[PDB]
Amino acid sequence: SSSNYCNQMMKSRNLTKDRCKPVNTFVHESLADVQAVCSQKNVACKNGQTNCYQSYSTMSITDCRETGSSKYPNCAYKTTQANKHIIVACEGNPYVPVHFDASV
């Protein structure tokens, strides 16, 4: 397989060790800065719930998407870098991100 960032991180983070996940996004910002999004702009989640929040600013993100010829155990990904607003669903106390709803 290829040694691109996506192939490597998806494996290291236990996302493709036992299957090939179609898509995943990695955020390159401090953990605390991402957690801070839970008190930023309140927006509706795709499912209709209102516990989602959109970051005020764009953040550095890497999008990982399976190629058309990807097949377990040899998962293969296309790596795309971008700067976009993230939308996260938050829950609990402390009020932190538990799901990524999207990226604008």
């Binding site: 983070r13 955020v27 890497t62 932190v96």
Partner: peptide, 15 residues
């Protein structure tokens, strides 16, 4: 086990 918050960090954060 792994909490929802922990899972989100493992799957999406690369500080």
């Amino acid at each position: 086990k792994e909490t929802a918050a922990a899972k989100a960090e493992r799957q999406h954060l690369d500080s």
